[PDB]
Design a binder for this molecule. Structure first.
Ligand SMILES: *[C@@H]1O[C@H](CO)[C@@H](O[C@@H]2O[C@H](CO)[C@@H](O)[C@H](O)[C@H]2NC(C)=O)[C@H](O)[C@H]1NC(C)=O
Ligand SMILES: *[C@@H]1O[C@H](CO)[C@@H](O[C@@H]2O[C@H](CO)[C@@H](O)[C@H](O)[C@H]2NC(C)=O)[C@H](O)[C@H]1NC(C)=O
Ligand SMILES: [Ca+2]
Ligand SMILES: [Ca+2]
Ligand SMILES: [Ca+2]
Ligand SMILES: [Ca+2]
Ligand SMILES: [Ca+2]
Ligand SMILES: [Ca+2]
Lengths: 284, 448, 93, 93, 284, 448
């Protein structure tokens, strides 16, 4: 219903003046069409500035919202042009969830498509992913986070925790791609690009010369992390032992960009801000 | 050309005089005639790469890589920069430095720690701060590229403002090594091309003597970055053997996979980039190019576009050669030895209490199998309930090799007893299953 | 009436080995006042002996609506869903 | 099962004085094999004593569909219609 | 698809000449508008002849075919213009009806709208009439006739029989109109005009000089009579004693046509063919 | 003019000679100058009015009403008619006879029984068949219309073919009666206008003498058809009294009904057709025509278009006169004595445990009632539960005539006890209920 950026451009298209102004902006300004390093305008900088200013007082300049489900990429292309670029605690959560009308309702609403009835059948991944996003969108942090970020003392607890997202269906895939390519593939879709950027924003270091974040950053990090679940960039705990997390990717055949791939991956695999935020939720 | 560092750093104070020299950058060559031409980005940058302001203060000598203050940075300058820093305290400001017409190798970032005070009194500076930057530098030098000057030791704001303090430098631990820092030289250079196969990393000792003499020493690390020193070997060598069935048509039947690996570094284009192509195929006939190999995937398994026939012959030479350009070529050869020689089936209806001559000929799979795969050298069998398991020989498929499946004399079959039989039909070369097993269904009543 | 009880999943006796729990609701109570014409007929057909009355019976307090699906992970890390397992509304049918 | 019996309207005991007749069909027989998950739960919840089991009961053989409307004229020349009075189909609900 | 007579007249209407010729024929020629005995032309015979001849070479004069399903009567009007022209037996019926799936179903389908729940409420007459027509249309003569034409020995039987059609709703009305006016009003409606004419045809005397019909005419008479039930011309037994029947009309204020009104009424009230046919059904 | 019979009849045989006279028809007058002109319809008709064939055989004398054969009907003629008779045996054929430029009075049907044989031998005919038609005729003569010849007795085919048989006729039982059949006359006539008030029906005796004399007698019936012999009487005579309420406006208030009846026959236009109109209304004022009476319905009740006022006066003369034409007028008079002098209500909310001064004034119907009907001479009462029945005087409407309904001191009213009261309000002239009773609803709680 609410297209967002795309709808707005449609509104712009309706009037001749706005369409022309938009055309000039596209012609004059690189937007994010070229590499930033290149950021060489198609014409000249002065011309781009004028074209940009030309948009003011038109329907155009819009913010791109996620709501463009099918056409996230198209939305993102637009918008970016302007923008840039056993007892245990996991068991207590499962108990609290089922004993609540909203959580029980939304827990099974996602388990339903994420599981398979028979051994060599296969789940619908998109139904499982959508329902996953529904779960963290509709169930308050209280019950939704208890499932995912519960502290553990033994493997029965950790094996339970790692299963929350039904990894077999939602996480694992036959081939493990390269991390930088999947980043690319995530940035095409409107939903993933939106959720990936909040992750990188909310779960970044203190912005002093220390590689740790602050306590006031904690909630925003966990929200940003949890929002990744059900996207192409879905993360899970990599083993049944630690809090180390990662998408379904690795750094094989990174060629000349091996430094950048491992850097991207250690933002998942060795994130101190995330580690601390997860530990804070189920500890003190 | 490439910088010998990705990042440089110095300090800047309030009210440093226009004319203060700051530091040098250095670009080494990728080819012998290359000569750097240095220029700065347009802006100064602050915390988390905030774009602060056009750079009105620092200039660079385009031939020599000397950065210096064209204009002093007074209290008001530092305020204009601070207020543009998005609310973060202004601790560091940087500039980009490009080496022709920001990432290593072609762009270096120069960082300055800002200190909201005047440059300190000369007599207050300890040897360590007189001698080297606050964190010692480390260097990047490419193997197999021309040697040249990659560092300068003297701290330029200290030599400028404290010219009565004498400072001298030398290296230790470079004996037989490719580094020169000459008596009375403040520069360090390499003397011959480096080579990662001989040494990947150096760690020399830089020694500063101030003045009464006091000495400070720091490590001086150099990382060797890569060259196509190495060529590729086919572990296979001569793949004497390869086999493909005779005359088997397909989009691309996979005859066999040959592989190669490069000694060089995988991250280096030298090792990793290996490509496979078939240089030759003798004989020319029947078709000149019967096969193809996937160059890039490194699967490098040969696939055949065209048909094959009884031992005509086959010999291919495969080249791994990294590139047309300067890459090391190498080959291995393989001989392909040719093996010399659609919609599912409907359930069968049969009528109960059936009588008449023993053998009731029902279906014929053989002219399907040989029809599809183009072979009669295949042995057909049948297994499941009435054939091979429980009720035994009720359905039997033929000591003669023609895939005729028939009902035998189970006293004509009883629909009260068993009213349906499900049987699996097999085809097998000489031991090996060429086909998947089909499922046959025989129902026992009348009509249809 | 509708009634509710807080239970372990193993208490349900459905063959699951787990530690997860649930709220289970059931319909119970007397409700056989011969509401409909059909049920009035049965009481009368028995009183005047006409039926013989082998296994004929009147309205029962049964569930009319069912609650949400309930999920759980068992001790063997396998998920399960219970459907149409707990009552939402009760009526005599 | 479904069962049928041929009856006078006065046999229905519904307060009508008349001479007209009808075919009446009713659902009878045992049918309590605990079909659904809900009904499996009840049998188990009682066996392990957990319920206490006040007035809780399982599935009943009740009508699922009803026959056509039946009309008649009484001794006083007044018409009447019986609705939802005889069973067409039977099930355990 | 093929209207037949009506379609042809439509074709005639298209052209001005044909329409005019048709108009003249209607004005000049009685057609079957009046009683044949009357067959007095609206103008004079010579004028009618000329008008008739006037039709030749026009689309008009058509044969009327059956295919006009819904509007048979309209077609017939056209086309004819040219062409011409307690134990008891009523209780056993009520028993047999209810013990049968079709009859029980259709008996109550008509009792439902024909009766009222409370004293001074009033039935929907058109719903009651439609359902009545449905009853005699869908239930075989066997069960449908047993209800209406049952022989009786006592008043319990006759009072039952007279109630079959739920007279209070379907028969009776506050004012009793004149019989000839209601005939007029019946002839306006397609259904009544069709059912009234079959009555007059099927239940007429032997066509010798005797005022009685034959046994081979019996079935057709009862069908024609029963088909009147649910029309404006609905007939019922006038008392609880005899087989004398009549519509809801009388011959008050017939003016100069008093002879013709009583003649129409005695076709209902003193019909020997009907009387005999009714008696034959439930006697021998 | 009208025929003296609706239907005539004779016999026709095969091979009767062209020139055979058949019978006469007769038309009597409705006015003295009227003269019939007879013509036949175009066709012959058979069983159930089947149209058989154009009539090529029988003609009529237009002035005299003599029917005769213009052409003989031979075997082939009777075949052409038989085959057109729709499968019915051909027993009777008829023609229509019109008496100016088929129903009585202006059209007569002439029926012929066909006998498939020759006319019989004269010597075979018995007196009865020589003398009268097979069924004797009966006659129609209108009261108060000119007398004239209405019958002729001789059987024309018998006089023609058997002229040696003498036949003579007379009447009996006509003494002092209006009928003449003169010595040697074969015609019968009336002598003066008839009158249904004196005699509705005559039954004379017709007597035929054949030849040796033999006599046959048959009844000779005559029915008198009607005249406006009578005038109309108002049973009311002078309706001294009539009453209408004063100044009551309405589309048509019905003041009163006057009625009249006519002695004449109802089926006759003379009796039945009576019309009522008001000839005069004195006085002229205020409005000249205050009333109207329904002329035709014979309801003939006066209704007033205009308003009325206190005894101005009123006198109307009513005329029943059958028609402008020759109808008998008569009158009666009535005096109108003038009587000298919208959407339903919402439920009332009242608040429980209410305290404050006794009488709680709630609603006022009086300014509605007098407002709508325009009268204060009306007495209001209230009855139901709290007023007049059970709890007694909780609600009381006023010894003073102004339709104010109030709650009294029932100790302030308890919503636990009774939470709703339904009461009916009455208005009554002087004894009589002028209005329908309204229903008032009082609810006992707060808010709204
Ligand atoms: C779920 O199961 C647990 C363990 O079986 C139950 O806890 C026990 O219940 C008994 C009987 O009421 C208590 O006396 C004890 O406190 C528990 N057992 C032990 C050994 O400590 C628990 O009641 C069950 N919960 C629900 C909701 O059914
Ligand atoms: C309807 O009622 C009648 C009369 O009550 C029933 O007929 C009697 O039934 C008894 C008991 O079966 C028989 O012995 C008699 O033949 C009847 N009584 C008398 C006095 O003769 C009839 O069975 C009932 N019919 C139905 C279908 O219920
Ligand atoms: Ca090397
Ligand atoms: Ca190398
Ligand atoms: Ca190499
Ligand atoms: Ca008279
Ligand atoms: Ca008269
Ligand atoms: Ca008169």
């Amino acid at each position: 219903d609410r297209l967002d950026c795309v709808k707005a451009s449609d509104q712009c298209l309706k009037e001749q003046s706005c369409s022309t102004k938009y055309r000039t902006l596209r012609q004059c300004v690189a937007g994010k069409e070229t590499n930033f390093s290149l950021t060489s305008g198609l014409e000249a900088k002065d011309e781009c500035r004028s074209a940009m200013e030309a948009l003011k007082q038109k329907s155009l300049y819009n913010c791109r919202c996620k709501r463009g489900m099918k056409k996230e990429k198209n939305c993102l292309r637009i918008y970016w042009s302007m923008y840039q670029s056993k007892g245990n605690n996991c068991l207590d959560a499962a108990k609290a969830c089922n004993l609540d009308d909203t959580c029980k309702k939304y827990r099974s609403a996602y388990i339903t498509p994420c599981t398979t009835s028979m051994s060599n059948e296969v789940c619908n991944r998109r139904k499982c992913h959508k329902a996953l996003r529904q779960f963290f969108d509709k169930v308050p942090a209280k019950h939704s986070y208890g499932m995912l970020f519960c502290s553990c003392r033994d493997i029965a607890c950790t094996e339970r925790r790692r299963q929350t997202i039904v990894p077999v269906c939602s996480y694992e895939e036959r081939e493990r791609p390269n991390c930088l390519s999947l980043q690319d593939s995530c940035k095409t879709n409107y939903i993933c690009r939106s959720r990936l950027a909040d992750f990188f924003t909310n779960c970044q270091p203190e912005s002093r010369s220390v590689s740790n974040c602050l306590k006031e950053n904690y909630a925003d990090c966990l929200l940003a992390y949890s929002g990744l679940i059900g996207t192409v960039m879905t993360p899970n705990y990599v083993d049944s032992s630690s809090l180390s997390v990662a998408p379904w990717c690795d750094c094989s055949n990174s060629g000349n960009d091996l430094e950048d791939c491992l850097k991207f991956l250690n933002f998942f695999k060795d994130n101190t801000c995330l580690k601390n935020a997860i530990q804070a939720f189920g500890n003190g | 050309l490439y910088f010998s560092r990705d990042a440089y750093w110095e300090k800047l104070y309030v009210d440093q005089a226009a004319g203060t020299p700051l530091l040098y950058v250095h670009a080494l060559r990728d080819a012998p005639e290359e000569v750097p031409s240095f220029r700065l980005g347009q802006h100064l940058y602050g915390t988390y790469r905030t774009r602060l302001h056009e750079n009105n203060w620092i200039r660079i000598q385009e031939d020599t890589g000397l950065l210096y203050l064209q204009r002093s940075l007074d209290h008001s300058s530092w305020e204009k920069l601070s207020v543009r820093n998005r609310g973060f305290p202004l601790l560091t400001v940087y500039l980009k430095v490009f080496l022709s017409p920001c990432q290593w190798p072609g762009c270096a970032r120069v960082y300055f720690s800002f200190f909201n005070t005047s440059f300190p009194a000369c007599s207050s500076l300890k040897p360590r701060e007189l001698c080297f930057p606050e964190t010692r530098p480390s260097f990047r030098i490419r193997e197999n590229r021309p040697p040249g000057t990659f560092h300068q030791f003297r701290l330029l704001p200290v030599q400028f403002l404290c010219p009565q303090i004498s400072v001298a430098y030398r290296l230790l631990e470079g004996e037989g090594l490719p580094f020169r820092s000459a008596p009375d030289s403040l520069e360090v250079s390499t003397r011959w091309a480096l080579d990662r196969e001989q040494r990947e990393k150096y760690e020399l000792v830089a020694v500063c003597t101030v003045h009464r003499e006091e000495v400070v020493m720091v490590p001086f690390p150099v990382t060797v970055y890569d060259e196509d020193d190495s060529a590729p070997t086919f572990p296979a060598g001569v793949d004497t053997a390869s086999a493909v069935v005779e005359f088997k048509r397909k989009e691309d039947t996979v005859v066999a996979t040959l592989r190669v690996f490069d000694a060089d570094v995988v991250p280096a284009s030298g090792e990793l980039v290996r490509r496979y192509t078939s240089t030759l195929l003798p004989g020319d006939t029947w078709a000149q190019q019967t096969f193809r190999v996937e160059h890039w995937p490194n699967e490098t398994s040969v696939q055949a576009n065209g048909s094959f026939v009884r031992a005509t012959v086959h010999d291919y030479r495969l080249v791994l050669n990294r590139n047309l350009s300067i890459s090391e070529n190498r080959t291995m050869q393989l001989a392909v030895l040719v093996n010399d020689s659609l919609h599912l089936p409907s359930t069968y209806s049969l009528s109960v209490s059936r009588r008449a001559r023993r053998f009731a000929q029902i279906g014929k799979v053989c002219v399907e199998n040989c029809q599809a795969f183009s072979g009669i050298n295949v042995q057909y069998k049948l297994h499941s309930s009435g054939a091979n398991c429980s009720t035994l020989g009720v359905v039997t498929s033929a000591e003669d090799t023609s895939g005729i499946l028939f009902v035998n004399d189970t006293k004509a079959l009883r629909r009260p007893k068993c009213a349906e039989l499900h049987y699996m039909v097999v085809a097998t070369d000489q031991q090996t299953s060429r086909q998947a097993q089909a499922q046959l269904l025989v129902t026992v009543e009348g009509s249809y | 009436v509708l009634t509710a009880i807080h239970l372990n999943v193993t208490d349900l006796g459905l063959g699951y080995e787990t530690k997860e729990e649930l709220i289970f609701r059931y319909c119970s109570g007397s409700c056989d006042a011969a509401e409909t014409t059909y049920d009035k007929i049965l009481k009368n057909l028995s009183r005047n002996r006409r039926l013989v009355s082998d296994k004929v019976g009147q309205a029962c307090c049964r569930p009319i609506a069912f609650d949400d699906d309930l999920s759980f992970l068992d001790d063997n890390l396998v998920y399960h869903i219970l459907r149409k397992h707990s009552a939402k509304r009760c009526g005599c049918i």
